[PDB]
Amino acid sequence: IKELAVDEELEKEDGLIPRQKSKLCKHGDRGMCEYCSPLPPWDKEYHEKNKIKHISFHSYLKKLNENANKKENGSSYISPLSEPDFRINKRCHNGHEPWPRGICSKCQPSAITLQQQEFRMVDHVEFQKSEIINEFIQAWRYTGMQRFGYMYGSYSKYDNTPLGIKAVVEAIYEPPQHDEQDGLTMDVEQVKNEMLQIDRQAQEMGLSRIGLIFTDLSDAGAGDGSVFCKRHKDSFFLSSLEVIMAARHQTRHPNVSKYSEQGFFSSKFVTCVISGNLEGEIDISSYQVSTEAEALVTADMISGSTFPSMAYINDTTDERYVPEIFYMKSNEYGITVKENAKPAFPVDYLLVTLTHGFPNTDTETNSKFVSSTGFPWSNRQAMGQSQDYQELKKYLFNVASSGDFNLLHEKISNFHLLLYINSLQILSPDEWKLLIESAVKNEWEESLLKLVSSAGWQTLVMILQESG
């Protein structure tokens, strides 16, 4: 099987950390005893020294390869990187062949200790431009209600975190949803039918749906104060209703891995939320879900509770056997061992954090999508920017009826403009594929003149001039 091009590059590099000679070393200069030996990239002591709170899963893959492959014979190639299962094997390899009549300890799911995950799949989410997500908050500034979107992007290496993958996003697509002041809830059938055609155009453009965003602002008084502070240390970090939508999105998009026995493991999916800081701004934060316990129990046992920090655990009806969930908390006198014989266990423990950021404006490798970021989006029907062909006379117009190719190609690289053109499918699919590849790639000057000489682009500007 074949993995991603980014995932195979992190596997080949060892990522060792070099050290220097010290006063504690008693050996010679041409050697190393223990104090200047090469440090492994999975040691968590070096991680918390530089305030890195997770061990960068590609290095966690290396720390399990040392346990799988040894100096001894072995002759196995097991590679035990699989999803730990809480479901019940029906055959059970014993005399209690039905679960209605019989269950023993080798098939019973053990009591969940609630230990936090030490490794994250995505180590650092990054963005492309501050003007891209400024249009997303501007949707709230016009209708006053919450929004929703899906992030399309790619992946590359990250040199800050040892053996880490960074998440790059390029554009944000919004599905048609019904907004509300308190929260939001849309139909999953019309979104999945709409997201199927966007994945078609994302393949030729080199994009993949790897993220989503949802807003939560609660403006205070619209004067000096920006927003309220809903999510803090004493309150919930992520609501339990949005854990369900984050869990189903990770199971729909698996990550291919040759080390896993099933063929897919350790999904690379980000969930970002606009919530605001403690003091005064609308700074965002992102956390992703845990694979070890939460990713498998969401198929059978997650039920909604009235508290945003916790989630209710329901009962067993003849196939849905669940084990007891335990966690430690302080009582009125001291700190005690596991107490939970009670439902509504918290879900903030099962989240691992990420580091969001925006790159510097002075230099970058590329940006690939900065045309205007002011074009009316596809499914923004709550706002007034959902126009017909009247907008195409205002937006591009083949500027001033005779456009220069340095000023014409800079507008054609928009994500939602190219996704609006092919829906009319005036051009051929072969000429459309070279149209979107010219706008997204470099050395575009020889191929842009091929587009203007084609009869399909001439019919597009002729059918636009007669219409309003």
Partner 1 sequence: QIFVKTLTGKTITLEVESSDTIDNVKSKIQDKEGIPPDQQRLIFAGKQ
Summarize as ranges the residues that interact with Zn ion (CB under 5 A). 25, 32-33, 35-36, 92, 94, 104, 106-107
Residue 377 or 420 with smaller CB distance to partner 1:
377
DSSP string computed for 178-229: -B-SS-B---HHHHHHHHHHHHHHHHHHT-EEEEEEEE----SSSSS-----
Shortest Å, Cβ 163 to Zn ion? 24
Residue 106 or 394 with smaller CB distance to Zn ion:
106
Residue 26 or 342 with smaller CB distance to Zn ion:
26
What span, in angstroms and rounded, lies between the C-alpha atoms of 189 and 9? 37
Shortest Å, Cβ 384 to partner 1? 17
DSSP string computed for 364-382: -S--S--S-S-SPPTT--S
- Name the residue among 197, 195, 211, 304 with its Cα closest to residue 250: 211
DSSP string computed for 68-104: HS-SS----------PPP-S--SSTTSS--SSTT---
DSSP alpha helix (H) spans, 280-347: 294-297
Measured at CB, which residue is nearest to Zn ion?
107
Among partner 1, Zn ion, none, what does residue 307 contact (CB within 5–8 Å per kind)? Answer: none
Total Cβ atoms within 10 A of residue 278:
10
The answer to whether the beta carbons of residues 271 and 223 sit under 8 Å apart is: no
Residue 234 or 318 with smaller CB distance to partner 1:
234
**Residue ranges that bind partner 1, judged by CB under 8 A:** 50-53, 115-116, 126, 130, 134, 137-138, 140-141, 160, 219, 222, 226, 232-233, 237, 281-283, 287, 327-330, 335, 337-338, 346, 348-349, 351, 353, 355-362
Shortest Å, Cβ 282 to partner 1? 4
What span, in angstroms and rounded, lies between the C-alpha atoms of 250 and 287? 13
Among Zn ion, partner 1, none, what does residue 351 contact (CB within 5–8 Å per kind)? Answer: partner 1
Among Zn ion, partner 1, none, what does residue 49 contact (CB within 5–8 Å per kind)? Answer: none
Among partner 1, Zn ion, none, what does residue 329 contact (CB within 5–8 Å per kind)? Answer: partner 1
Shortest Å, Cβ 123 to partner 1? 10
Residue 36 or 461 with smaller CB distance to Zn ion:
36
Shortest Å, Cβ 364 to partner 1? 9
* CA distance readout (Å), 286 to 246, 272, 330, 357, 433: 12, 4, 28, 10, 34
DSSP string computed for 234-255: SS-SS-HHHHHHHHHHHHHS--
**42: amino acid identity, one letter:** W
Among Zn ion, partner 1, none, what does residue 9 contact (CB within 5–8 Å per kind)? Answer: none
Among partner 1, Zn ion, none, what does residue 25 contact (CB within 5–8 Å per kind)? Answer: Zn ion
Shortest Å, Cβ 140 to partner 1? 8
